[PDB]
Amino acid sequence: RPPNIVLIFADDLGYGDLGCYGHPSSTTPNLDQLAAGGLRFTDFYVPVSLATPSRAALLTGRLPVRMGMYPGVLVPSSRGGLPLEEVTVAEVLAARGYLTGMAGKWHLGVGPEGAFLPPHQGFHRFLGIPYSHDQGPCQNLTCFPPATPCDGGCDQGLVPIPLLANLSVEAQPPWLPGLEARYMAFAHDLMADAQRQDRPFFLYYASHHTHYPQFSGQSFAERSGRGPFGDSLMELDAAVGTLMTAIGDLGLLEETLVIFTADNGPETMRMSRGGCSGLLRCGKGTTYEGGVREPALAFWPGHIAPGVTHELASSLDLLPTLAALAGAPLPNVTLDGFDLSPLLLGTGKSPRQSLFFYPSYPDEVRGVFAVRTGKYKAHFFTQGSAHSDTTADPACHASSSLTAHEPPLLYDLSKDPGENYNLLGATPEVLQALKQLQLLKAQLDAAVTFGPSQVARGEDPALQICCHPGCTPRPACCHCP
Amino acid sequence: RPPNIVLIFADDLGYGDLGCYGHPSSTTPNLDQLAAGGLRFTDFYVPVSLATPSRAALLTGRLPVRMGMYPGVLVPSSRGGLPLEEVTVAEVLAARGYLTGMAGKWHLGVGPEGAFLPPHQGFHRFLGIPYSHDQGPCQNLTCFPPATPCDGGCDQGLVPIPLLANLSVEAQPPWLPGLEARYMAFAHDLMADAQRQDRPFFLYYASHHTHYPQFSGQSFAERSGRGPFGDSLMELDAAVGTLMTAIGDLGLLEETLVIFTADNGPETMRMSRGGCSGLLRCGKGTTYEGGVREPALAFWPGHIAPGVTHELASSLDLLPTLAALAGAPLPNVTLDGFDLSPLLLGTGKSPRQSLFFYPSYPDEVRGVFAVRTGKYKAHFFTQGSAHSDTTADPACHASSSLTAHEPPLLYDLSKDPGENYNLLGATPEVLQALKQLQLLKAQLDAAVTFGPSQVARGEDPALQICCHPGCTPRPACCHCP
Numbered sequence: 001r002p003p004n005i006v007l008i009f010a011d012d013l014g015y016g017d018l019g020c021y022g023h024p025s026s027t028t029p030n031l032d033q034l035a036a037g038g039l040r041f042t043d044f045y046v047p048v049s050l051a052t053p054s055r056a057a058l059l060t061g062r063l064p065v066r067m068g069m070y071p072g073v074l075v076p077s078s079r080g081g082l083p084l085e086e087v088t089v090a091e092v093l094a095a096r097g098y099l100t101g102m103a104g105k106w107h108l109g110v111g112p113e114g115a116f117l118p119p120h121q122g123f124h125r126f127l128g129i130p131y132s133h134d135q136g137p138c139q140n141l142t143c144f145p146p147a148t149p150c151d152g153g154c155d156q157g158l159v160p161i162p163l164l165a166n167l168s169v170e171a172q173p174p175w176l177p178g179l180e181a182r183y184m185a186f187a188h189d190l191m192a193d194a195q196r197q198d199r200p201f202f203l204y205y206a207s208h209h210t211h212y213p214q215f216s217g218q219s220f221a222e223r224s225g226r227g228p229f230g231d232s233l234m235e236l237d238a239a240v241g242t243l244m245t246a247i248g249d250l251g252l253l254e255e256t257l258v259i260f261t262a263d264n265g266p267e268t269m270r271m272s273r274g275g276c277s278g279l280l281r282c283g284k285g286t287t288y289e290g291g292v293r294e295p296a297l298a299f300w301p302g303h304i305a306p307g308v309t310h311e312l313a314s315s316l317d318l319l320p321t322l323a324a325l326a327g328a329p330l331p332n333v334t335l336d337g338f339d340l341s342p343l344l345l346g347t348g349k350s351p352r353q354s355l356f357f358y359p360s361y362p363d364e365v366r367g368v369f370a371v372r373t374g375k376y377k378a379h380f381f382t383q384g385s386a387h388s389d390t391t392a393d394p395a396c397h398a399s400s401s402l403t404a405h406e407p408p409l410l411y412d413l414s415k416d417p418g419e420n421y422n423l424l425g426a427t428p429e430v431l432q433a434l435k436q437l438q439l440l441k442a443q444l445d446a447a448v449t450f451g452p453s454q455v456a457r458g459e460d461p462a463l464q465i466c467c468h469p470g471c472t473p474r475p476a477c478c479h480c481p
Numbered sequence: 482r483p484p485n486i487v488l489i490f491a492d493d494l495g496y497g498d499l500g501c502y503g504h505p506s507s508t509t510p511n512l513d514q515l516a517a518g519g520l521r522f523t524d525f526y527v528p529v530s531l532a533t534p535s536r537a538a539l540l541t542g543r544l545p546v547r548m549g550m551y552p553g554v555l556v557p558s559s560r561g562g563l564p565l566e567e568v569t570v571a572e573v574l575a576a577r578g579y580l581t582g583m584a585g586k587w588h589l590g591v592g593p594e595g596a597f598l599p600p601h602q603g604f605h606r607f608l609g610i611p612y613s614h615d616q617g618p619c620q621n622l623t624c625f626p627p628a629t630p631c632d633g634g635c636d637q638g639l640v641p642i643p644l645l646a647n648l649s650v651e652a653q654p655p656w657l658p659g660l661e662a663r664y665m666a667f668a669h670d671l672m673a674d675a676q677r678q679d680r681p682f683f684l685y686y687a688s689h690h691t692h693y694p695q696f697s698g699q700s701f702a703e704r705s706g707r708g709p710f711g712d713s714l715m716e717l718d719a720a721v722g723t724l725m726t727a728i729g730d731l732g733l734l735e736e737t738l739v740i741f742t743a744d745n746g747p748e749t750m751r752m753s754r755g756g757c758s759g760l761l762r763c764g765k766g767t768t769y770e771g772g773v774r775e776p777a778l779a780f781w782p783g784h785i786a787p788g789v790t791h792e793l794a795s796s797l798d799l800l801p802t803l804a805a806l807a808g809a810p811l812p813n814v815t816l817d818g819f820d821l822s823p824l825l826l827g828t829g830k831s832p833r834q835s836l837f838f839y840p841s842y843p844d845e846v847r848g849v850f851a852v853r854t855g856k857y858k859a860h861f862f863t864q865g866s867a868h869s870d871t872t873a874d875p876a877c878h879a880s881s882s883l884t885a886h887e888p889p890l891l892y893d894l895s896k897d898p899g900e901n902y903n904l905l906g907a908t909p910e911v912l913q914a915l916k917q918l919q920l921l922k923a924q925l926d927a928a929v930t931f932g933p934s935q936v937a938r939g940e941d942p943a944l945q946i947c948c949h950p951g952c953t954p955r956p957a958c959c960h961c962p
């Protein structure tokens with residue numbers, strides 16, 4: 001009975017990048033087709049605009065400060081990881097009998113002997129890279145075949161990026177023009193195996209598109225008419241078209257819920273090789289709408305009727321909604337999301353009225369940076385980020401430093417989604433929205449205690465995955481293409 | 482045989498305002514439905530981002546400097562107007578037997594005894610206001626029923642806005658909450674009368690939405706969830722839904738070509754009561770993409786198949802395309818547009834490769850400000866405008882004065898439609914695009930001679946339309962509600 005679930009999570013992709021979200025040149029026909037027969041959200045959100053914290057929140061339904069996933073993101077030498085006691089969505093569904101799989105980016109920790117890798121967090125199967133694909137040297141990697149090298153080099157002084165099958169290194173580094181196809185093959189097998197055993201499957205496809213450095217297989221190199229960023233988005237979109245074909249071919253259309261979102265807004269510091277937040281302001285690394293408001297699509301023919309909703313939804317609501325849909329029980333922990341099955345099924349409204357946004361570097365003295373309630377969003381603190389530099393808006397740059405606002409900056413996102421016109425720069429609707437927003441911020445700051453930072457437990461170069469264990473010299477001996 | 486034609490032209494509406502162009506809160510379901518069964522253009526343009534010059538170019542297929550429609554816009558006391566010797570599209574179709582009508586904004590001149598009004602330029606029927614609805618006092622007008630007054634007062638010291646039936650004043654001023662409906666009634670009658678006489682009709686519906694001051698009838702007041710700007714856009718959209726119903730009811734679906742565009746980009750100086758250029762830069766009054774790149778839809782079931790094109794098209798191409806479609810002959814004048822029927826019918830590509838943009842205040846020493854060819858756009862001069870003030874981009878403000886660029890600022894609009902990354906800030910594709918762009922600018926500047934300015938022929942307060950001719954005191958005695 002429980003539907004099969006496929007969760008596609010893109011990387012560094014903005015609200016204005018899909019064709020269906022208005023981009024003038026992107027090529028995304030499969031995603032456009034899913035929107036046209038599915039529910040397109042205009043107001044869906046992640047609570048923190050960086051990969052690690054966002055990935056933690058999506059898999060646990062909890063604000064990332066609760067389990068220490070701050071500040072910044074994890075790196076290959078990190079000792080820390082998402083604690084093994086947090087219950088992931090994967091555990092929740094596995095315990096109700098789903099065959100569960102993950103392909104692609106994890107970024108939730110590696111640890112001493114791979115203790116934090118996915119196999120330990122509820123996934124039966126895993127094929128991917130344990131952190132972003134740019135966290136290792138890439139000046140010699142090919143990003144576009146036959147031999148266009150990746151641009152800029154990526155991180156130096158580290159082992160090459162490992163492609164892992166469960167806990168074993170399959171390739172180091174992998175060939176980027178074919179990674180995707182490896183991931184579609186793995187998915188195809190997970191589906192079939194599950195059909196075979198009469199069991200519901202759960203696929204978590206964390207794609208590398210459209211994170212720097214851009215890359216694609218040869219059918220897309222130079223065919224999107226938006227350069228490398230388009231080519232990489234176009235391959236992502238073709239991958240979605242492949243999952244939907246596989247779902248067709250096994251007669252699983254009406255029994256599969258397919259969700260598409262992305263972890264955080266665009267990295268505009270990659271300029272024309274990064275994504276686009278459309279009308280929204282700034283991008284990745286900030287708490288402006290461009291960093292935390294993502295594209296989101298839900299498709300389940302015969303269950304979700306085609307349309308557009310404006311209701312509030314978050315990545316935080318994913319665990320509890322999917323649990324409900326699977327008749328799986330909720331962990332016995334404080335959860336920060338809700339079940340949105342009534343909104344999906346068209347029988348109710350979203351129960352979500354408020355959203356809370358933390359910065360990349362949060363702290364317990366300042367607490368939440370911004371809050372949305374209804375149509376009103378207040379910013380109590382503002383800051384730009386080097387991930388959102390290079391555009392003409394000075395508030396997005398790294399040089400717009402941390403600034404306190406009291407009274408907060410207050411926007412009406414139904415008329416001013418661009419966040420340009422501070423409404424306190426008076427009215428009774430406004431004044432009542434102000435008092436609610438301040439009381440929600442002070443209630444959340446007083447009730448959440450920050451879990452001890454995983455990121456500050458430090459780095460140890462010995463934790464890098466090495467294809468040729470014990471080899472020498474480290475790290476360049478670690479490699480098995 | 483010739484199809485019936487309905488040209489809907491909106492006012493001050495941006496590229497990111499329709500739901501189908503990505504806006505998160507606008508409500509435009511009829512327009513979204515026309516896009517879903519029609520051709521949606523991602524790269525359609527007007528050559529000048531102000532009402533008068535844009536309206537002239539659309540009706541004549543000629544760059545507005547050729548017939549003197551600069552600088553700025555005409556005002557109620559203007560002696561000048563679009564010369565009576567220019568051939569409009571309306572003349573062209575009337576001569577092939579179309580019954581032709583216009584409802585709404587004209588802004589192409591009034592003149593001594595209404596010499597420039599529409600009845601003299603090929604329209605058989607006319608119901609509307611001869612210039613924008615804000616060109617007269619509005620501190621006492623109702624914008625939203627039952628008694629919400631228009632905001633800010635509009636222009637002072639002038640006669641109230643006249644609603645005209647051909648050359649006679651029907652109301653002065655008209656009641657804004659019902660103007661629209663008057664215009665749908667007139668349209669409905671034009672259609673029916675033409676069906677009756679077995680003749681093809683041509684309707685030019687120049688709506689007042691979404692120009693300041695915003696207004697709507699009671700079914701839309703406060704129902705769009707985007708405030709007054711949404712309410713006004715929502716009424717516009719409901720009007721489109723009414724024309725399409727009338728077309729249904731007379732069995733004229735497959736025989737009517739329906740086109741939707743807008744004259745110029747958004748007036749962001751009205752802030753949350755003005756429109757949104759989406760990812761594009763700046764708006765009304767500039768030569769950035771946000772001022773000149775508009776939404777555009779073409780719908781003709783059984784002739785135009787549903788889709789999205791990225792080909793180049795301009796408002797300038799409208800006369801010659803519609804002539805071709807009607808088997809009407811072209812005037813014997815130099816035209817600056819082309820026939821895009823092959824692109825509409827799906828048998829050819831657009832023949833347009835280049836676009837030329839003039840500023841609101843052009844001059845023969847500086848010539849064209851920007852040129853697009855292929856995917857490359859060069860700006861030879863840049864300037865902000867008080868119509869595009871109040872956003873965070875400093876290049877859009879009135880204080881960014883006229884600046885020459887040599888080498889020009891050069892953008893790749895397929896990867897950088899936001900116009901952020903100057904490519905000369907080297908490569909052979911770039912260098913060849915540069916040499917083409919400079920040669921196109923110098924060829925057009927050398928070949929176009931500016932027609933003598935109509936706007937500088939001056940003003941005469943005696944040219945104001947007065948409901949009670951000879952009354953006194955002028956202008957406040959002029960009024961007949």
Ligand SMILES: *[C@H]1O[C@H](CO)[C@@H](O[C@H]2O[C@H](CO)[C@@H](O)[C@H](O)[C@H]2NC(C)=O)[C@H](O)[C@H]1NC(C)=O
Pocket residue numbers: 099124125126127165166186189193
């Ligand atoms: C590593 O781990 C999983 C689980 O052990 C491997 O398991 C699957 O492999 C085969 C099917 O592909 C079968 O031998 C097993 O039944 C199957 N196990 C389960 C629980 O499904 C898997 O191949 C490896 N991970 C992947 C796909 O890389």
Ligand SMILES: *[C@H]1O[C@H](CO)[C@@H](O[C@H]2O[C@H](CO)[C@@H](O)[C@H](O)[C@H]2NC(C)=O)[C@H](O)[C@H]1NC(C)=O
Pocket residue numbers: 580605606607608646647667670674
């Ligand atoms: C004013 O001018 C036109 C043309 O004279 C008027 O003409 C139309 O009015 C009636 C139908 O609505 C008929 O009496 C005429 O046949 C018809 N003329 C043509 C050529 O169609 C019209 O009513 C006035 N304009 C409008 C609609 O306001």
Ligand SMILES: O=[N+]([O-])c1ccc(O)c(OS(=O)(=O)O)c1
Pocket residue numbers: 011012050051052072073107132133134135211
């Ligand atoms: O924030 N960072 O320091 C950072 C570093 C490397 C990434 O590759 C990255 O992108 S992220 O992993 O998607 O957040 C972010």
Ligand SMILES: O=[N+]([O-])c1ccc(O)c(OS(=O)(=O)O)c1
Pocket residue numbers: 492493531532533553554588613614615616692
């Ligand atoms: O540019 N102007 O000076 C101007 C004046 C009044 C308008 O109402 C206006 O808007 S316009 O008529 O759409 O261009 C523009």
Ligand SMILES: [Mg+2]
Pocket residue numbers: 011012050051263264
């Ligand atoms: Mg990311």
Ligand SMILES: [Mg+2]
Pocket residue numbers: 492493531532744745
């Ligand atoms: Mg206008």
